[PDB]
């Protein structure tokens, strides 16, 4: 429930699914569900 | 593409899998309660009329 609260959406072979170096310390660098929502939905 | 080249069927069974090596290569372990509901309509045959009437 807590991770569901601190979760982030984004609408639209490309760069935004990556783990950019600006996410360091802000985005959880190891959380995203599988499937087509991989790489995009993020958590803090 | 949904109803003409392969559809949802009858006489179907879907579950989880598990392993065992004590079975053999041409063997699959079906649950007993599927066996109580998966069935086969075989014709009345004199070759095992006793066993088929015993089943019914």
């Amino acid at each position: 429930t807590l991770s569901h609260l601190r979760r982030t959406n984004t609408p639209i072979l490309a760069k935004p699914r990556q783990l950019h170096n600006t996410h360091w310390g802000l985005v959880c660098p190891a959380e995203t569900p599988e499937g087509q929502a991989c790489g995009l939905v993020k958590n803090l | 593409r949904g109803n003409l080249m392969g559809k949802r069927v009858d006489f179907s069974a879907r579950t989880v899998i598990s392993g065992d090596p004590n079975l053999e290569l041409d063997q699959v372990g079906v649950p007993k309660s599927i066996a109580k509901t998966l069935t086969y309509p075989e014709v009345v045959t004199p070759y095992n009329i006793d066993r088929l009437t015993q089943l019914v």
Binding site: - | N3, K7, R8, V9, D10, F11, S12, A13, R14, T15, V16, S18, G19, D20, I34, T37, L38, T39
Partner: protein
């Protein structure tokens, strides 16, 4: 599932006379595959078992804060001072012959997770249930016994 991606299912079950046992007379509850480890390299699982053993024996609790300076040599000295093998090994016994197994056993406790996806929640079997109206096909969905 475990806590590091070694998820799996309950293969088959025994009771304790069939289940193995050790030189202090304890049994494990859940044994895993030794080939499940060295591909995915989840060394976290081994270190969790080992430090959990040291902590749950000595009474204190293992520092699971991640970027600390805990060494396997540290857990080793603290385990050998209790008196098992320094890397954590043991000797278990077979449940049928009771023979000393020629190799050893690595042993320890670990927090395990029950998650969802039960066997009575993935089972599905249809032998001529009711049909549709438009296509009159076999229906879909478990709660009306779809194909």
């Amino acid at each position: 599932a475990s806590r590091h991606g070694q998820k799996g299912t309950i293969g088959i079950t025994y009771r304790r006379e069939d289940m193995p046992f050790t030189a202090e007379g304890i049994v494990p509850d859940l044994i895993i595959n030794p080939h499940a480890i060295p591909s995915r390299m989840t060394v976290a699982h081994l270190i969790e078992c080992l430090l959990s053993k040291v902590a749950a024996l000595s009474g204190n609790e293992g520092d699971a804060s991640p970027f600390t300076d805990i060494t396997v040599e540290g857990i080793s000295k603290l385990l050998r001072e209790h008196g098992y093998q320094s890397r954590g090994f043991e000797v278990m016994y077979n449940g049928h012959t009771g023979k000393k197994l020629m190799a050893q056993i690595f042993f320890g406790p670990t927090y395990y997770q029950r998650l969802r996806h039960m066997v009575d929640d993935k089972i599905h079997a249809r032998a001529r249930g009711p049909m549709q109206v438009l296509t009159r096909q076999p229906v879909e969905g478990r709660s009306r016994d779809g194909g």
